[PDB]
Amino acid sequence: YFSQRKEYVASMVFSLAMGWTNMLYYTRGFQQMGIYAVMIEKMILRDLCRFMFVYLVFLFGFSTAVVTLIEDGKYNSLYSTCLELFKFTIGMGDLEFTENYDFKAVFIILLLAYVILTYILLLNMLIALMGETVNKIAQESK
Amino acid sequence: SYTDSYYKGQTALHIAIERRNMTLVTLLVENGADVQAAANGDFFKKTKGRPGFYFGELPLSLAACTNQLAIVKFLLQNSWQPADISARDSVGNTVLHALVEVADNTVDNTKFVTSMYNEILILGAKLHPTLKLEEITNRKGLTPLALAASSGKIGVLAYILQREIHEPECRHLSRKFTEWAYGPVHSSLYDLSCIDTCEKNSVLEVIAYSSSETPNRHDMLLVEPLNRLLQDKWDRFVKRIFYFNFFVYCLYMIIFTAAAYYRPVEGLPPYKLKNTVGDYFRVTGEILSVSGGVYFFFRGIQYFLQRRPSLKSLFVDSYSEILFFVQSLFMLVSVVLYFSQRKEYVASMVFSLAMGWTNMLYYTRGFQQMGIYAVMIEKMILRDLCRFMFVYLVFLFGFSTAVVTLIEDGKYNSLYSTCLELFKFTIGMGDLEFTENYDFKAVFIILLLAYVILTYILLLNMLIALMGETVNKIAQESKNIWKLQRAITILDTEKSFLKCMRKAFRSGKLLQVGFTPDGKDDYRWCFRVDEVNWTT
Amino acid sequence: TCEKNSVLEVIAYSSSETPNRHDMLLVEPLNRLLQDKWDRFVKRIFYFNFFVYCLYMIIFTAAAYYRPVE
Ligand SMILES: C=C(C)[C@]12C[C@@H](C)[C@@]34O[C@](Cc5ccccc5)(O[C@@H]1[C@@H]3C=C(COC(=O)Cc1ccc(O)c(OC)c1)C[C@]1(O)C(=O)C(C)=C[C@@H]41)O2
Ligand SMILES: C=C(C)[C@]12C[C@@H](C)[C@@]34O[C@](Cc5ccccc5)(O[C@@H]1[C@@H]3C=C(COC(=O)Cc1ccc(O)c(OC)c1)C[C@]1(O)C(=O)C(C)=C[C@@H]41)O2
Ligand SMILES: CCCCCCCCCCCCCCCC(=O)O[C@H](COC(=O)CCCCCC)COP(=O)(O)OCCN
Numbered sequence: 001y002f003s004q005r006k007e008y009v010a011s012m013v014f015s016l017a018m019g020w021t022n023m024l025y026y027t028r029g030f031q032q033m034g035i036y037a038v039m040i041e042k043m044i045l046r047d048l049c050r051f052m053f054v055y056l057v058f059l060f061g062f063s064t065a066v067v068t069l070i071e072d073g074k075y076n077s078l079y080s081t082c083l084e085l086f087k088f089t090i091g092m093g094d095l096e097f098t099e100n101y102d103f104k105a106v107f108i109i110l111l112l113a114y115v116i117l118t119y120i121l122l123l124n125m126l127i128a129l130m131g132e133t134v135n136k137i138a139q140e141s142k
Numbered sequence: 143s144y145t146d147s148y149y150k151g152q153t154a155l156h157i158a159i160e161r162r163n164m165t166l167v168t169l170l171v172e173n174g175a176d177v178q179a180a181a182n183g184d185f186f187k188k189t190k191g192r193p194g195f196y197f198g199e200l201p202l203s204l205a206a207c208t209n210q211l212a213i214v215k216f217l218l219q220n221s222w223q224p225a226d227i228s229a230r231d232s233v234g235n236t237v238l239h240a241l242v243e244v245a246d247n248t249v250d251n252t253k254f255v256t257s258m259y260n261e262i263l264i265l266g267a268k269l270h271p272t273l274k275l276e277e278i279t280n281r282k283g284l285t286p287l288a289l290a291a292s293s294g295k296i297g298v299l300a301y302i303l304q305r306e307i308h309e310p311e312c313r314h315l316s317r318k319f320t321e322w323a324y325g326p327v328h329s330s331l332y333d334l335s336c337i338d339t340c341e342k343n344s345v346l347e348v349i350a351y352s353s354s355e356t357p358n359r360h361d362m363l364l365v366e367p368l369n370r371l372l373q374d375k376w377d378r379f380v381k382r383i384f385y386f387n388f389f390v391y392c393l394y395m396i397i398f399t400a401a402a403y404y405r406p407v408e409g410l411p412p413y414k415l416k417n418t419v420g421d422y423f424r425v426t427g428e429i430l431s432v433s434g435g436v437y438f439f440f441r442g443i444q445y446f447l448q449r450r451p452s453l454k455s456l457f458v459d460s461y462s463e464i465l466f467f468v469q470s471l472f473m474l475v476s477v478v479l480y481f482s483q484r485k486e487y488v489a490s491m492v493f494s495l496a497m498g499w500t501n502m503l504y505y506t507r508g509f510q511q512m513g514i515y516a517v518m519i520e521k522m523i524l525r526d527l528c529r530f531m532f533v534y535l536v537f538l539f540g541f542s543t544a545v546v547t548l549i550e551d552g553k554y555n556s557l558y559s560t561c562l563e564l565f566k567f568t569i570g571m572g573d574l575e576f577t578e579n580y581d582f583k584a585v586f587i588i589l590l591l592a593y594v595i596l597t598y599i600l601l602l603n604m605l606i607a608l609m610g611e612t613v614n615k616i617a618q619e620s621k622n623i624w625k626l627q628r629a630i631t632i633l634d635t636e637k638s639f640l641k642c643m644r645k646a647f648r649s650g651k652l653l654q655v656g657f658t659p660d661g662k663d664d665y666r667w668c669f670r671v672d673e674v675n676w677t678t
Numbered sequence: 679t680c681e682k683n684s685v686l687e688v689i690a691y692s693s694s695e696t697p698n699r700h701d702m703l704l705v706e707p708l709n710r711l712l713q714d715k716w717d718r719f720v721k722r723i724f725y726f727n728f729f730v731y732c733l734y735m736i737i738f739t740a741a742a743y744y745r746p747v748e
């Protein structure tokens with residue numbers, strides 16, 4: 001701010017966001033409510049940290065395969081393709097095969113394989129593990 | 143004798159009985175110690191939020207509560223200063239009330255307390271045959287049976303309702319009367335007094351309208367005479383009345399829906415009737431709808447005034463009455479806005495209409511199969527969503543105001559639109575279409591993806607795991623929940639009944655024993671049960 | 679009150695690998711002490727801290743919302 005850069009807005013906003021979620025710290029010590037803060041702690045530190053490597057392997061592998069196969073289109077940059085395949089993981093892609101392009105059959109096979117592997121299989125694996133972690137610490141709530 | 147505010151009234155006889163010294167008790171009673179002193183200090187009162195020993199404040203109560211029968215017989219029979227068996231404390235609890243209070247639904251405690259209760263009743267019959275201890279109520283108007291039912295003492299309740307004494311000169315204290323037995327089957331009579339018709343506070347009223355903290359609220363209905371009573375009342379007359387009420391409610395909602403759908407669209411209510419068929423039927427439907435709203439309104443007020451529920455348990459019990467009452471309130475507010483010449487009555491009417499259908503789920507209670515869904519919806523809403531709202535709103539507001547602050551000039555530049563879109567993202571129907579030209583786009587993307595990962599993936603599945611655990615918690619308890627709801631329905635149907643008859647009795651006013659302590663005979667509304675048991 | 683190293687400090691600031699870190703607080707004098715200190719004076723201080731943090735965040739939000747756009 002004092003260095004004459006408008007980029008301070010960016011830093012400010014992150015603190016503002018964090019400032020609200022840190023109010024979960026004050027749920028600790030209520031017998032009913034503290035379990036939610038604990039569950040979030042355990043899930044972020046254990047489950048997402050371990051799952052991240054697996055998912056990034058799958059994401060980068062299929063993403064770079066798609067970018068290599070495609071030439072001259074929207075899917076010709078790592079940025080857009082990573083965004084799109086990540087959208088497919090969390091079930092908000094669209095698989096609209098409405099482009100004129102080469103090796104269309106192989107492109108379709110790859111996207112279907114990725115969708116099955118990440119949406120159906122991996123994501124429910126993670127959700128199963130998170131459910132295990134959540135149920136494991138209900139009885140320790142006291 | 144202790145004179146402070148903590149041990150007020152404690153004296154030597156209490157110490158001797160407490161120490162289990164027969165010799166010192168005999169000497170103290172010999173020397174003229176008061177056998178009816180009241181030790182009512184704060185250490186000795188009935189209380190939960192302070193360590194203490196409540197026994198009923200009297201030496202006889204102390205002796206009974208401590209499993210010392212010899213001292214009880216001494217105090218009652220000894221001629222230096224005999225003890226009154228029917229004495230009461232400051233709470234009004236007699237020895238039997240004190241015995242009920244010290245139960246804890248364990249095997250050995252059940253054996254002790256049941257034994258001491260039985261012996262005291264026999265001795266009371268012998269000493270004062272015209273005395274009826276079991277009809278003495280404490281300060282709150284509870285008999286020992288009602289106190290046991292309210293407190294959830296399953297052992298004492300099971301003992302009392304199934305009490306039998308095979309001995310003359312005390313047989314009139316029995317309640318279960320075995321008339322015959324065959325190989326696997328035996329037929330008996332059950333006394334039934336103050337189960338159905340006591341006029342003050344019956345057992346079924348106490349069990350049904352308990353405050354949901356009672357440790358065995360639903361197991362108490364499995365005790366045999368109660369279970370047979372509820373089944374008989376259900377099959378005899380209540381079942382038909384319940385189905386009739388459900389059918390009438392269905393007709394009411396059909397009329398209400400039809401009237402609501404065909405509202406006039408012209409401005410400025412109220413609207414005047416034209417001499418045409420559709421107007422007559424529409425106005426008829428409106429009048430019936432408002433009538434139904436007024437009916438449910440006054441039923442709600444009657445319920446709340448009769449029960450007087452506390453704020454802490456206002457919703458934990460009485461969920462259904464609250465929802466029916468809120469439906470009534472929306473209907474009345476709609477009527478007020480209608481005759482006040484405002485369009486906004488449509489808004490109020492609509493909410494009542496929606497509520498009117500979902501309250502149909504109240505009638506799936508009392509089915510063994512179907513009532514579990516109504517119960518699950520209630521518990522999920524009352525526990526999981528109400529606790530989870532604070533957490534989720536903290537996240538929503540944090541990222542919402544962050545994004546609004548970052549962005550200048552766009553659709554994401556007001557709290558309303560950004561809160562709605564972030565909510566859409568949380569339930570998995572966003573767009574993520576990062577196609578707008580605006581500054582700080584990288585930070586915007588980082589914020590939004592962090593929000594998606596935090597709320598869509600993580601928190602939402604946390605909620606779902608918790609709700610699923612709740613459902614699996616009560617997959618098992620269906621059988622008991624069904625019975626409890628059926629009991630509440632039966633009592634509620636008994637209370638109104640809209641015929642001026644109170645034929646709530648089961649079997650005849652039969653002579654039970656015929657041989658009282660005096661020359662009279664007792665007719666007691668006994669109820670016949672033929673039980674079967676394949677043991678041996 | 680130890681002045682060097684008390685029991686509650688040792689239990690509370692343990693490294694989470696201690697086998698009975700949760701059960702050690704159920705020992706009766708400790709459980710009563712924590713309940714007593716909570717009800718005596720700490721509970722009001724904690725609620726006051728939470729209230730002040732709420733006010734702080736509201737002030738921060740309002741100040742950030744109305745930043746100048748030049
Ligand atoms: C320092 C770490 C470890 C951390 C800091 C930030 C970036 C964080 O994301 C993480 C990584 C992350 C990012 C996005 C999704 C999942 C995980 O986890 C926390 C950190 C994690 C969260 C979410 O965790 C919470 O529910 C807050 C919280 C939970 C439990 C508590 O006991 C607690 O006490 C203070 C606070 C909030 C953020 O700080 C936040 O508001 C933003 C913008 C990102 C979250 O990085
Ligand atoms: C009075 C309360 C507590 C309540 C009243 C309304 C606003 C309610 O939303 C809530 C809050 C809410 C709103 C939206 C989603 C979840 C919860 O829960 C009920 C209330 C909750 C429901 C949903 O609950 C049901 O399944 C009805 C029901 C379940 C079990 C029963 O035993 C029962 O007997 C009457 C009825 C129906 C609504 O009343 C309805 O139709 C509308 C429009 C909103 C629902 O507020
Ligand atoms: C399940 C747990 C593990 C999950 C891991 C999450 C992985 C998600 C990966 C998504 C990356 C999507 C990046 C968006 C690309 C983009 O939209 O483009 C970006 C825009 O800039 C940025 O926002 C910087 C990158 C954002 C930082 C992002 C962490 C570059 O610039 P261009 O606009 O010119 O791209 C020109 C092309 N149109």
Ligand SMILES: CNC[C@H](O)[C@H](O)[C@H](O)[C@H](O)CO
Pocket residue numbers: 090091092569570571572
């Ligand atoms: C179907 N197009 C997107 C939907 O609107 C919805 O957002 C999405 O399909 C769900 O998240 C997956 O079930």
